[PDB]
């Protein structure tokens, strides 16, 4: 009975004997005793091996978790919590672990439904239990502006009032934004803020009306309220845009990205790259060519969605591939490889696979289906970051991101019902080795290991949708 | 009175002299509608013709006025202007040597929001080139919905990646041993974007219950043949009955899916889920064709599942009227395909059950509007399985309201003109059967109920467009029932 642990470790092997009767990393395990409210449990930072790596060995003499950093030890304490099993037991085990990708991220949409600091802090602890080390907050969209800026003070004043569906809006104060980045730092997580521009910028026109263009509608139909110069409370996308040829548009992005970078010590500033429907490719090329350079000279590494990779601007910019794992193109396989030819890496977030906002085939009502139908937990796992990567190299993949969009999610219970269990397939694709190695990196194994951690998920207060695709305990 | 098809809602001649075109007329700056009018000057290779998009009136409606000073086409949409720009081409006449627009004022509006033409790519794979031309031909008659019959017992024509073996091993063949093929996802975007520029929506159909022999070629675990005692087989000579190998015949209702196998619905969800992502149009046509000998409860449970699958995808599902006895689906749209007299079954009653469910009817009577039905005159190809060949008059001898069981015109989504490709292997073959009688489709779709909507007037107006149809390269068949120019 191989002890179930997710993400699947690099090397795991049972031990010969009988199992184990039960700095600040110790607090992470002491607080982990929510699964179960002399012996000596060793948590030491030796160092020398790869970053975010650890070594776990459990016997009856003592259990020893040894990481190279505070992060590596913090991923070893997360593994031991999953290892915890008539009494309360830790199996005779030996784990030597290391991450496959340096970026192992979770995205949160705070613009569609404004999520408070508390429900964001909880999601940080939940993602950290799966060895995820990057929180991606989607701070702006057509439905709200969520970050408090002073170079653009009208934004937080007139663009944060509403949310999707007539629900409360709000924003993170700069006072409140430091709490998010310092809470995630204590969980060894970086916080990358995204400000979706060219398109996905309708709320920006509510406060600075000289910057936004009139909405382009196309075929709703579905609307039978379309977007106007008023707070958009719908879910349609790709209608808003900034005055791309107005220099005030870029003087706005400079203030917005300049002030934002001062509050984020993380290396990345995500600009988005969403283009409005019917926007010129050359004009959209000029847009993200300018704003990425603005972030470039700010001392930050710019991030954008892969649809802006054909552009001629930016150097070393990082991408977020949101296309399907079988890449059904507008050009999205070739367009994603433009980031690698330019000198940057790719973060892979396949829509059909890893988009956590996609409805379950089972049926928890929430979610969307715009990918290729609902997303089963298997399909969230039925992909390899290497083969589902056009024709690049593992050195050109910065990591894996698991986007959770909040068009339909308004609760922490709503967030957990959709993130888990499919978030485990995200951390597995991010942390665990490729599908070429690792015998436990199969659907038959993941489906069994993710079901054994079910009781552990219920003890930490983490909600999840029990997908009938897998067997729980 | 100047002939124009479909017959506009309100048309009246003017008091003065016509509009001389010459080589000095300017055309008003109306984006691509001017280019649509310039290409319409293929009939004939200062005063200015005004194309404007006002707005406020009915959807896809327009107003056309032609005098000696200037011509003005004013629509509420880009589609309304487009259909007004289409009426200009039909209006264009020749005085002696100069080309002339008659003094006339037209105020037009469509009767049905759905004005469809279906093309069968499964029996004979029609390339993107021959489909784009058919998009322009149907758009010249104010049709706004292209229905693609992407799959049948003879082939699978759309490229899916969740089910990638389909196009790998089910698109090799066509009926009669003819070339197969399929539309790539990249080739399918070109069709929907071309149709959008003509203000047409692309409705993709995947016949799901029966008409599914080709799916068994690639996913062999899903298919169930079933030969009836009738058939033709021995007489036609070999005429290979259906097997577990590509079917090159024309018989229908022999294949089916294992209705109680859950992989069949996980199959349909994957295909329809990927399909919906490729179509910005609101409609996903599921079919509803039941195999011979299928249990009514089983066929009901099948279409109950797939329509809910399409419904939960954010799209409106479409099916044939034979799937109306089912207990599933809500608000599903329908192509009624039975005769205008509503015959063998509760075919009218089963179609009226869709209206009880909250949906609308698209009516496509086989005896009336089936463009693949043989002419009584005789241009060879086509079928006659309805009630014999279909004359151009018989294609027009029906009212979409009266033939509609016992409902209301508000419960009719519109009109569809299906062209099945069992015998049609060329674009010239498509036009030889689609046209004349596709005007009777646009007439029933666009024009008011039974105006100039009589057989005596139709046969005069569509006969005047002969030179216009010959100028656009449309190879219509000259039915002897009507006089041309």
TrEMBL record, chain B:
Keywords: Glycosidase, Hydrolase, Signal. Coiled coil: none annotated. Residues 2-109 form the Beta-hexosaminidase bacterial type N-terminal domain. InterPro entries: Beta_hexosaminidase_sua/sub, GH, Glyco_hydro_20_cat, Hex-like_dom2, HEX_bac_N. SUPFAM superfamilies: (Trans)glycosidases, beta-N-acetylhexosaminidase-like domain. It is an enzyme of class 3 (hydrolase). GO terms for biological process: carbohydrate metabolic process; glycosaminoglycan metabolic process. It catalyses: Hydrolysis of terminal non-reducing N-acetyl-D-hexosamine residues in N-acetyl-beta-D-hexosaminides. GO terms for molecular function: beta-N-acetylhexosaminidase activity. The active site is at 290 (proton donor). Its EC number is 3.2.1.52. Residues 112-448 form the Glycoside hydrolase family 20 catalytic domain. The keyword Iron-sulfur does not apply. PROSITE patterns: PROKAR_LIPOPROTEIN. GO terms for cellular component: membrane. Belongs to the glycosyl hydrolase 20 family. This is beta-N-acetylhexosaminidase. It comes from Microbacterium sp. HJ5.
